[PDB]
Amino acid sequence: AQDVDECSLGANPCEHAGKCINTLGSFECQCLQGYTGPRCEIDVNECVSNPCQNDAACLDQIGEFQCICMPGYEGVHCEVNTDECASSPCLHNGRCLDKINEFQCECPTGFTGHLCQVDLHHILD
Amino acid sequence: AQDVDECSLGANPCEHAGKCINTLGSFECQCLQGYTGPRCEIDVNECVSNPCQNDAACLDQIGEFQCICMPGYEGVHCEVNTDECASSPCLHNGRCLDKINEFQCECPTGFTGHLCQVDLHHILD
Ligand SMILES: [Ca+2]
Ligand SMILES: [Ca+2]
Ligand SMILES: [Ca+2]
Ligand SMILES: [Ca+2]
Ligand SMILES: [Ca+2]
Ligand SMILES: [Ca+2]
């Protein structure tokens, strides 16, 4: 069959607050974001297409995914390698190299270590 | 010429406290470590043979050299890459990888970041 407005019997036949739209012989559901199926029964797996980059963990949530980034990465898809050289950390005209969740200073001659702190022209004795 | 004991005239003809040994027609100097030359005049350059490894700075000193190591290296010749994994820093059965003046933790599934602190099996909600 059958001629009836399924949207007017009582409870909403569409799950997860979808909008019920009557048709002749059936009905249709206008689903909210993140829900699928004839009656919006399914919570879509937003992680199914592997959106999280750089070995991030994908969290399948309500109408969205969340990425948990590997250290040193950021962004919605963990697509951004954080720039550790942004604060220009190298002393004495050292050159900063960005790495993963860290930086490297390329010190000029006569200077060492991590931040080029040690003056070796200073070894005056 | 000439017949004379150069070691008995007065001052020591050998520099840098070398031992004066008389010979017929001359004399010879028995130099202390780090000195060379007929009269021990020269302070040997202990850095001449490039003893300092891994881009270390060589200091030419009295009868010895000293190496100034690049960060993460140690030893007389800076030949030792310091083992940062010695203290077993990785939490939750993470695997430690030794690097230069740093370490990397290879976390098992469900754990992140530097020391594998973050439990993601814990994202219970
Ligand atoms: Ca109908
Ligand atoms: Ca979902
Ligand atoms: Ca970076
Ligand atoms: Ca003599
Ligand atoms: Ca010397
Ligand atoms: Ca190391």
Half-sphere exposure of B5 (CA within 13 A, CB side): 7
Residue from A99, A112, A117, A123 to probe the interface with B (highest B Cβ count within 10 Å): A112
Alpha-carbon gap, residue A34 to A46, rounded angstroms: 8
The answer to whether B116 and B109 have CB atoms below 8 angstroms apart is no
Q: How crowded is residue A89: how many other Cβ atoms within 10 Å of its Cβ? A: 14
**Phi, psi angle pair for A67, to nearest 5°:** -105, 140
Of A59, A56, A77, the closest CA to residue B113 belongs to A56
Beta-bridged to residue B103, according to DSSP, are: B98
Token pair recorded at residue A63: 């109408």
Is A86 within 8 Å of chain B by CB? no
Name the 3-class secondary structure at A118. strand
Per CATH, the homologous superfamily of domain A83-125 is Laminin (2.10.25.10)
Alpha-carbon gap, residue B2 to B110, rounded angstroms: 90
Is B101 within 8 Å of chain A by CB? yes
Here the contacts of B101-109 (C-beta below 8 Å, separation 24 or greater) are: B101/A113, B101/A114, B101/B71, B101/B72, B102/A102, B102/B72
- Neighboring chain A residues of B69 at a CB cutoff of 8 Å: 112
Identity of the amino acid at A100: I
Residue A71 has its nearest CB partner, among B59, B101, B113, at B113
CATH number of A1-44: 2.10.25.10
Of A110, A80, A114, A79, the closest CA to residue A97 belongs to A114
E-only strand ranges, chain B: 19-23, 26-30, 35-36, 42-43, 57-61, 64-68, 73-74, 80-81, 95-98, 103-106, 111-112, 118-119
Token pair recorded at residue A74: 């950021």
- The 8-class DSSP code of residue B32 comes to P
Name the 3-class secondary structure at B51. coil
Token pair recorded at residue B60: 């030419």
CA of B12 to the centre of ligand 4 (A): 13
CA of B94 to the centre of ligand 5 (A): 48
Is B86 within 8 Å of chain A by CB? no
Token pair recorded at residue A21: 């739209």
Q: What does the buried/exposed string (b/e) look like for B26-43 if buried means 16 or more CB atoms within 10 Å of the residue's CB?
A: ebbbebeebbeeebbeeb
Beta-bridged to residue B68, according to DSSP, are: B57
Q: Is there a contact between A101 and B112 if contact means CB atoms under 8 Å apart?
A: no
**Phi, psi angle pair for B20, to nearest 5°:** -85, 125
Identity of the amino acid at B67: C
The structure was resolved experimentally with: X-ray
Token pair recorded at residue B61: 């000193």
Alpha-carbon gap, residue A123 to A118, rounded angstroms: 10
Alpha-carbon gap, residue A2 to A8, rounded angstroms: 15
In angstroms, the first-to-last Cα distance of chain B is 103
- What is Dmax (Cα atoms) for chain B? 103
Q: Cα B50 to the chain's mean position, in Å?
A: 11
Choosing among 3.30.70.1450, 3.40.720.10, 3.40.50.300, 2.10.25.10, the CATH entry for B45-82 is 2.10.25.10
Q: Is A62 left (phi over 0), alpha (psi -120 to 50) or beta?
A: beta
Q: Is there a contact between A101 and B120 if contact means CB atoms under 8 Å apart?
A: no
Beta-bridged to residue A112, according to DSSP, are: A118
- Neighboring chain B residues of A123 at a CB cutoff of 8 Å: 59, 68
Report whether the peptide linkage leading into residue B113 is cis, meaning its omega lies within 30 degrees of zero: yes
Alpha-carbon gap, residue A16 to B89, rounded angstroms: 46
The answer to whether A89 and A103 have CB atoms below 8 angstroms apart is yes
- The 8-class DSSP code of residue B110 comes to T
Report whether the peptide linkage leading into residue B30 is cis, meaning its omega lies within 30 degrees of zero: no
- Asked whether the domain spanning A83-125 has the same topology as the one spanning A1-44, the reply is yes
Token pair recorded at residue A46: 């937003």
**Entry resolution (Å):** 2.8
Domains in chain A: boundaries: 1-44, 45-82, 83-125
Alpha-carbon gap, residue A100 to B86, rounded angstroms: 22
